[PDB]
Amino acid sequence: SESSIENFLCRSACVYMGEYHTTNTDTSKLFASWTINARRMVQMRRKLELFTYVRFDMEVTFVITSKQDQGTQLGQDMPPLTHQIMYIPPGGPIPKSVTDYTWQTSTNPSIFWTEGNAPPRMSIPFISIGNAYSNFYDGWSHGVYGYNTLNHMGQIYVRHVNGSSPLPMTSTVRMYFKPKHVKVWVPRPPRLCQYKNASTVNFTPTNITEKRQSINYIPETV
């Protein structure tokens, strides 16, 4: 009953930790970004490789902290900061800067939040025109091996909701991920190799198990 599929997988984990600033000279360090694939968190990856097709809902909680730079200016009296967290479905537009029009589009679901309150949280349905996600794919996209276009699940963008010419602060986000209502099909043998990259199944040859003294060896009874 503790070996049920739901108790084995319905558990939370930190999957991404990014940093983003209020003012900078880089314009890519002004927002935080993460493509959502289930092959780049090594926590849940090996537990999912026991199965061939999976189907679940997704629940995401956010933990956000800030600090003021140690550059020059003290004596401030700042109000609490506001943060925007935008989810893009598979097939939506992608921003390029924090001042883009794409932060304001009516079809990207977004969350606004101010510090001191409870941490924010939203839930995602099973978003696939297919009938299950695919942990394994033996074939081509149309041409990249192993990758198909049915495992698109979206992206996450975070920025500050300041006005104009803000004060210099730097923020950090932790994204916590959790699957719900999980169903699996076609079990597979476990991975007896260390993972090399986050896209393929490539590996180096490793031994089957560890050695002992002889085929008759049994350690002494205490």
């Binding site: 090996r46 260390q194 089957i208 002992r212 085929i215």
Partner: protein, 222 residues
Amino acid sequence: GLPVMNTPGSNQFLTSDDFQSPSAMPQFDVTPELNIPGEVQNLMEIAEVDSVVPVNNVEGKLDTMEIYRIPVQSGNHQSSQVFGFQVQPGLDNVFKHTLLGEILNYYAHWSGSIKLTFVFCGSAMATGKFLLAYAPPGANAPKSRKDAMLGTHIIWDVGLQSSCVLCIPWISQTYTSAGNVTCWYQTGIVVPAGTPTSCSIMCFVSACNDFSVRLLKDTPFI
């Protein structure tokens, strides 16, 4: 209206909570389910499958197929030992990476009973006898064929049976304090003319119907 009183535990994010969550895409109808063959409800369905044991895990043969073959030699050697090991899945290197072994390393406490199966892979003209002996946990390994005969044993005649199955009741975890299994030459192998010389034994391990696991943890393999 409706006087209300906040209890402690408010506005915390607990990683193991089970609350409702706001959905980010309410105007979305999910794809209906498809009846894919091979649905899994429980991890005991994976542990209750036979898998091949790497018994010959000695120095030199850890990356060849020779690790799976027990080397039966020819001639008259009718008191020597063929093999021996302790029955300790999850800990011992013999049983560590099987299908039952990999599942047991996600849990901290487990207990059940094990089914072993031995298969003689020789030519159809070979005949002979073996003795398969089991000592309970606490007892020492036998040192001769005679005192193995005075315990719990079974005499296996490979000219009449190609396989012999063995159920072991009392299995758990915490210099062994575990049971063990050994095999002894009763007779020796007799062949006619124009046959291969050597012969081999293979071994399969699985779990019986009652098997319990508790306290999901991290796996110590990656």
